[PDB]
Design a binder for this molecule. Sequence first.
Ligand SMILES: OC[C@H]1O[C@@H](O)[C@@H](O)[C@@H](O)[C@@H]1O
Ligand SMILES: OC[C@H]1O[C@@H](O)[C@@H](O)[C@@H](O)[C@@H]1O
Ligand SMILES: OC[C@H]1O[C@@H](O)[C@@H](O)[C@@H](O)[C@@H]1O
Ligand SMILES: OC[C@H]1O[C@@H](O)[C@@H](O)[C@@H](O)[C@@H]1O
Ligand SMILES: OC[C@H]1O[C@@H](O)[C@@H](O)[C@@H](O)[C@@H]1O
Ligand SMILES: OC[C@H]1O[C@@H](O)[C@@H](O)[C@@H](O)[C@@H]1O
Lengths: 113, 113, 113
Amino acid sequence: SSEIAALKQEIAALKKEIAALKAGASVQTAATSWGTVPSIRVYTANNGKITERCWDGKGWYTGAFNEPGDNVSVTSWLVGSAIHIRVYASTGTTTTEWCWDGNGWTKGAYTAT
Amino acid sequence: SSEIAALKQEIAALKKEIAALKAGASVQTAATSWGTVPSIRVYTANNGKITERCWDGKGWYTGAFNEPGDNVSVTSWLVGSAIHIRVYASTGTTTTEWCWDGNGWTKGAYTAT
Amino acid sequence: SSEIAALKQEIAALKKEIAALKAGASVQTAATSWGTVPSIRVYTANNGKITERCWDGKGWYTGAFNEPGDNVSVTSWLVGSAIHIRVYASTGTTTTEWCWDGNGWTKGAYTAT
Ligand SMILES: OC[C@H]1O[C@@H](O)[C@@H](O)[C@@H](O)[C@@H]1O
Ligand SMILES: OC[C@H]1O[C@@H](O)[C@@H](O)[C@@H](O)[C@@H]1O
Ligand SMILES: OC[C@H]1O[C@@H](O)[C@@H](O)[C@@H](O)[C@@H]1O
Ligand SMILES: OC[C@H]1O[C@@H](O)[C@@H](O)[C@@H](O)[C@@H]1O
Ligand SMILES: OC[C@H]1O[C@@H](O)[C@@H](O)[C@@H](O)[C@@H]1O
Ligand SMILES: OC[C@H]1O[C@@H](O)[C@@H](O)[C@@H](O)[C@@H]1O
């Protein structure tokens, strides 16, 4: 019947659309750096978790940052030689700020409101 | 019939794929900062609109920036004490540059070409 | 029959969900800047390719950077007057670092591990 043949091309069209959406998919990164060496921190949202990779001039290694998020952005600044980093990790519509200030990642005051 | 049973598992498979796509979805953020206080600006693309949240050392508040976009990136620089911000808001394939230079957001010269 | 009418509303619901996913889609940008002029570089992931647009104070032009990627982030730093840029281009779960250090884009040591 042409009733079943119609829906068989309907699902075929939906497979073309879903495959186009899946084509664009990838991990999401954010990067910051400081000084002249330099130091570089690269944050990667992958499968709902954000991890950190670090460079201080002598090879790449995994940093202490490990939090949930499907999206990430980062900024940092120097107070003298001391580095301060702010990572904004988002899941759904909730965005949590994470703060490095010398020894450990803490939850920041940021809200979207 | 096994004709109807085939399409009933076809749509069931498409529900698994669409749910996987929706799982990764979230708001998209960009951040910049300047000075030593510091000042921080956080831009959030949510539901086709980009809004701005601000920190100058004494709590978070909503900034003047409000434009359309599903994606956002930002950079900024200091000319002395004066801050200049450039926000690149994208919808589809169109990317508009927005310029802060001391009093108001203006449309920048940027084009993708 | 109500067997065919059921699947005709099933596919209708999947069209609403796919259209919501396609609504959020856009090009993805990252930006960096340096100095006081300033110089600005804007990277755009579009249809699996990342291109670069440049500003050094006298109009926008297309830069040498051209690599594959569905996601992009960037950071840069000055060693004196010399600019160094690091672009992290991601496809699927693979993230390649690209390095500008004065004459040409080279593949960087970065790995996600
Ligand atoms: O030296 C490694 C450490 O560097 C700091 O700047 C932060 O990025 C930490 O998360 C990281 O573990
Ligand atoms: O020290 C913690 C505080 O640091 C500031 O720079 C901001 O990032 C605040 O949102 C944060 O709570
Ligand atoms: O002080 C608030 C103002 O700060 C400026 O740097 C910009 O971010 C404006 O959009 C904002 O309204
Ligand atoms: O002052 C306006 C101009 O400022 C420059 O720094 C660039 O961002 C231009 O694209 C913009 O049009
Ligand atoms: O002046 C143009 C050149 O500027 C450099 O800083 C890099 O961004 C190159 O990719 C670009 O071609
Ligand atoms: O000069 C090449 C090297 O430069 C460093 O700053 C890092 O970005 C390395 O990952 C890269 O391989």
